[PDB]
Symmetry: D3
Amino acid sequence: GFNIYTDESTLVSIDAGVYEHNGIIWVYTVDIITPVVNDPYLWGAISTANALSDVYAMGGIPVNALAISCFNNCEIFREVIRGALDKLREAKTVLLGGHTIDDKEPKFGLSVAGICPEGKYITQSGAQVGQLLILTKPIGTGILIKGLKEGILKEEDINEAIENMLALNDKARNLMLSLDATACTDVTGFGLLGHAWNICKNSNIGARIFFEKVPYYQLSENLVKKKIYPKGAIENLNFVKNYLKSNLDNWKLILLSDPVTSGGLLFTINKEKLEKIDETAKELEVNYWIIGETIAENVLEVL
Amino acid sequence: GFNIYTDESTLVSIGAGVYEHNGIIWVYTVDIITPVVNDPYLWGAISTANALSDVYAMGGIPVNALAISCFNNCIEIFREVIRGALDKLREAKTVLLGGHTIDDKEPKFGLSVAGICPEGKYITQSGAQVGQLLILTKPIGTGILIKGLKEGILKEEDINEAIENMLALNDKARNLMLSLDATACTDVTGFGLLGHAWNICKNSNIGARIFFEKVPYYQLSENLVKKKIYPKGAIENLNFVKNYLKSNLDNWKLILLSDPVTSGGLLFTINKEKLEKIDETAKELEVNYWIIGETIAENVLEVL
Amino acid sequence: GFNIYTDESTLVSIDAGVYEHNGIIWVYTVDIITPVVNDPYLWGAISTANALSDVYAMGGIPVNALAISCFNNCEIFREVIRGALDKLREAKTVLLGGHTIDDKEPKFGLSVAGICPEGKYITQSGAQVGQLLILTKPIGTGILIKGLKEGILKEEDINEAIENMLALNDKARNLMLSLDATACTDVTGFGLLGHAWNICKNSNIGARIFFEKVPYYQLSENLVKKKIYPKGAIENLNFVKNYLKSNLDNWKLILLSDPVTSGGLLFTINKEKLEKIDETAKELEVNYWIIGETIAENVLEVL
Amino acid sequence: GFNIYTDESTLVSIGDDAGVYEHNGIIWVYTVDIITPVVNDPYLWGAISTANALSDVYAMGGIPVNALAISCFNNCEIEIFREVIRGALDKLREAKTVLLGGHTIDDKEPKFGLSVAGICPEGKYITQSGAQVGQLLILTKPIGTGILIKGLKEGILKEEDINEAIENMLALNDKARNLMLSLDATACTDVTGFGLLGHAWNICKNSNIGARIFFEKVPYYQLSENLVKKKIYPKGAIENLNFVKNYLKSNLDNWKLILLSDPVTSGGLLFTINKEKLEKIDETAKELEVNYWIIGETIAENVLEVL
Amino acid sequence: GFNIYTDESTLVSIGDDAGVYEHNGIIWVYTVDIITPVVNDPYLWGAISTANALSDVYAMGGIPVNALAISCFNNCEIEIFREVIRGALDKLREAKTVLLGGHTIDDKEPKFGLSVAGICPEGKYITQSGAQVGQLLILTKPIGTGILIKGLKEGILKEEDINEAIENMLALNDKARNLMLSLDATACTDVTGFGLLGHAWNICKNSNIGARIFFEKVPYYQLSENLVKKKIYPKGAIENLNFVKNYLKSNLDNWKLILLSDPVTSGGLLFTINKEKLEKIDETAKELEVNYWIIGETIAENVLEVL
Amino acid sequence: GFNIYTDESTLVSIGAGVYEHNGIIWVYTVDIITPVVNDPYLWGAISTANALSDVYAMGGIPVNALAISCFNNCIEIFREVIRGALDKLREAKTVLLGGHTIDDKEPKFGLSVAGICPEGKYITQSGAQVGQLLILTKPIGTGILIKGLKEGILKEEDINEAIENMLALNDKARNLMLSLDATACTDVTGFGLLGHAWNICKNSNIGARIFFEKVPYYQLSENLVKKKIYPKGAIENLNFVKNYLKSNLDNWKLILLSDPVTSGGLLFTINKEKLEKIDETAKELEVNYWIIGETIAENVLEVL
């Protein structure tokens, strides 16, 4: 008889993007990293957790993925894939295959596709003034990873960091969504200050972070005080310098700028949500730290 | 780098449908008819013109089509039917994509047609206004002639003018119609002139006044109807409009006006200020026209 | 360079079915009903909640839908659609259009498409012996709807039933998933006994239901005792008679077999989950009633 | 129950994303055209660039259907682009063309344009290779915009001094397309960056024929003549002239050849018609509300003559 | 950067889901064939029905690629079907054909079969309308299964009494297809429900030619002859004979015409070859490991002669 | 009622790829070459045979192709090139879908080809076993002849046999190869006989022993190489296999054996028990063959 049918879709690309089609939202991300530990299996697992986090940070549910590496261009990859498969299985994400890239520097990662149901798509631009900044994993891995490279540390010294890098941000995403977070991102290569600033620039606001409230590995502090830290840290710190307000020692600023690998989620929530955060977090079995709040002035304050 | 792409489409089916996709509008129609003349080739050509008319009436440009018939189910003759359809389609710059056989025993042939309505020019039947003139581009009365031909009362040679008109594409009429900024349009086929005029009135929530003495029809059509010679479809069309018909005209006239038409012309509404151009526009486009009436406020069909 | 790509999909049809493609699961359902109240708007809203429940019952997240009615074949539909749109908006589901059917009997409903993330697809065949039967809405609407038709009741008398028929089963789905239910279905036209039996047949087990533990409207009891009940009730009761074991009065069996409109979810959970059901249910803001347990013998016991 | 269905399509592309697509009787044309700022008004830049991009489709006898915006975005500089888009949207609305989105390009040099898709109904696909000997060359807009835009940059002229040219650059070639189709033109192209001579030569090469152009019949802004004489002209004019020097025969003063080679922005259509068509060209143009100038005729010798 | 791409496809279907599809040089054939139980062994029913369905593709010179199971399922009666599927799977594996799934039909009468898709490489698409006069008719399996399956139902015979026929019904016509293609056959069909005469007539009608069949050259089960004489035969045989009575010329005893019209299940291929091909037919068949019988020749008169 | 449908596919790209979908396997390859003869038509035909060989070598049946060249970028001659490609494609029952122009200045032409491997018969280069015989279906040494022709040392008339072999499709050879149940196969082209033999050894983790006196090559090829006349590609191929080459043969022989071949024959491995059929099978299929060696355990190339 009489029939009416409509179809609509939108694609936004910034192999990264967001796709909406008749009510469903898909997010696509790509993330590849250089070895962080001298164990192929751990590298595959960590790289996978790191890549999936791009999706979790958007409130997404990872669905499938493609392995990406410099194969042939850079037996070890067999262990790398084994580690990636285990982490993917834990994440209930399907590996659809792999793509080789032209690069001589050893790198591995994934391109991931996820879904954001009921329009629950979270960006880095919805933050408002007077909200709390919540972080779900410690920082300082960059410092530890360098310590390893310099032969100052051994893997056994940083098992806590490795355990955190291995951890999926699925529980963190659930906490973030449960508290109706207005903005979210994960903490990786740009450091805690860099990613916080990303939220500040895209939301047109500023942030106040309290160093004493930021979780980090004791060993990261010990190493940074002895001038042991990655270059990315200096690059990150300088990137926010023209917007940074702080009278804290340089080592604290370097620590806060240290490139993180497979870090936790960094998101903003209203002060009222503070009433249920601990209980919600406990039920979900995920850690959280309240590190500061957003301000109107477009600067980054650290005290 | 930063890229944004959108896509949207809508499909509206009534049977026959209209599809819009990112700015372009396609119209789809289907029309099959029983033999109207003894010549298989002419039957193919006439059915084709008749099927394309559906698209022309909507302001569309026919693009492609699919032949539909019960061949092998109702063979050497269908070769001529296709030949006629192909020649007419070539004339209409429309491509034949193939054919489909339906479950039927009664000899019938026609086409499924797909066309496009450029610049959003999609002409419907619900945009007519009161005080406009009703224009018709082809005479009526073919149903009565076809009956006579079937009855053996007439020969094809007697109705050559009707055959020429049935064979004629409504593309020039569509252009005239668009050129005069028509507010509504439809083609005249099986439901008779009154029926299709009523379709416009119904959809435009308006009325129409038609003058019998201004309606073009074949002389032979009048002679046959006066001898009680006409299609049963004429009675069906008349009885269907009688609840909305206001007229005192003799029966033969109402029957003639209700006579099912094959590959008829276009019936459309234009403003009276266009009456100054219509003649020169029609001469250039090479298409005849007849002012048969005007729209009125009262929702009825006034046949005077 | 070297590339490997795989693609796989499965389609199962019983316009109803399940579709799996590279890790994602979609469920498609169709559900249309006759008017249940003399208010077009309420009918549109209720029919919508009822149709979406087919998806919720499978653990699905409704995404989009198409309206289905006997339009032209049977101004009122304008209010029907208005009601359907409101309920769809509440459900965060997109209406893509409508399809007309050949029928002279006034009916309206939806065809719905939903998603089941992380393989969380729930059927009616995973129930095991010794599990608890949980129900999330009262039964007895069929009796009340007849009472209305017979002019014995007026809409105002059954506002509680109307409120329940209007309610989305999204919170119930969340409870059901949170408790890791092994099987689930919603309660509609086949009555509570019929749908329970559906779980029994597909899971190859039986069920024991306690009448005194089943939630139902007081007015439904009053009416059924006075021989006021729909035919579907008798049809449902007879459908399970050759598998029914009970010494309860006929009115109680008729009530339990009464066709429900937009009923709650009926699912099975392990006894241990009983420890968190109340708290979980309270957090989700959804009611629940423990009406019985599954048994090994393939019969339906009611006491 | 017998059934027979056929499907066929052909795609011919030139390079980037410019091509012709035919599918079961319908013909689609795709083009892309981006230009550097023309005037100092952001809004006018978006509007003019749009008219310019749509022209590639009109010139092929096409009806624009939809488009995609293309600009350096963030790679060149974000308040002017808002105005640029506003101008584009207004011009597209006028052209009844839908904007489907946008695409960014890595370019430090400010540029904006559109990728456009249009259709050519009833196989009315007009190319640059169907011209015959003895046909008339028709132009629908004056030339000389390059020289005026140059003078505007040299501070020699003010924005207001070229309102006539701006009005012409803003005008859609849809009416010109209709005239061209109505007169059954055998070949058509629009006049842009390559200058009148260059675009005329494109028809000559692809049609393997020649052209004879009469300078005194060519429409151009008087202000453009005033400037070329004063050595005021874009370098693109010199390049264009040099591009056609191997096939050019003329004894005219250099300033005339420079004017004729001057890069045009959003110019008119340049097409060929049979001589008999002169009988109704004037009446048709007035009805369509478009201007036209008969600037010459095609000849057999594969050369370009200007006198 | 110049590019030209073309695409074309044609689809011809007969009714249900049986047709021929051509797309840019490749030809796909689709067929569907379901039969009622043939023997009392569920496994053999699935295996035989499969060989029977695949035959529709082999007969067209095709290579089966994938299939879909089709059965009444739940509409006819669920332990036998498990065995039926097992038989189908074994036969498909042997045919190197992938089972993509299944489809249920509303039918109370027990039936099972397959929808099959295959390809005809290098345009080797063999039909029933390319036969010429003076060609030989070749058959690759005996006929008479209808009469034996009938006797099995009448309790006249035991399952074991027809192991020879069962072995032939189980055999894939892939080797026969290879022989047919190797000898450059001009037309081919398989012999099923319509009987030998009926399927031979199909070639005659579509090729607009005639056939002359020699009864003494036709291979058939001796047990089949024994039964027809005793009035033991399927009614389908009578129907088939009547279907060809308007085009049949023969003076042979009725039991011979009944045998020749007897419905066959999973029969051999019936194809036409030029007489010169007899030179290598025997050697080729032995190499391919397939049997063959020359049963007659085609003639000009559009009739069916049996002597 | 109750219906279940599944779908699955895999794509493996190496550059060139293999695609499997619900039981069918398609292979995709690409091959372009510089002019080898002065005749534009012969160049088109030879390049085509050379491009199709990639598919034949895998046991495939070519279905369609796309022409690839730098025409207009490296015109009246390319008309002859296409004519030659079209004639050869017709012979191969392969359809030309169109063409693509690449960014290159050096005159080159070839095709992108798509083919199918029926009944799962996908022949690779990693299934050879020790103790098998190495079969070659066309002589080698065309690289040296083409060099001589380019140098003006030879005329096309002098190398008509090489041209006939370059023009020949490897479809008959593929059939022979499949007929003898070959365990591995490849075609001989630019990497020379030793190079392609090594590809099989490398992928099969086996070795090969080749007898120079059993290898077919054009007499003129031997004469030219002995006069220091040969393609630079020959030196490149030889130096590439020298780390896996065990031989004491004179330089000219190794160079000849490493000489880049154009539209060469197939090189495949079969069991010695097949040596009793190969001759009659080859006569029927109408294809020449040469037993040039046998596979060995040691992972090297023994050229004796």
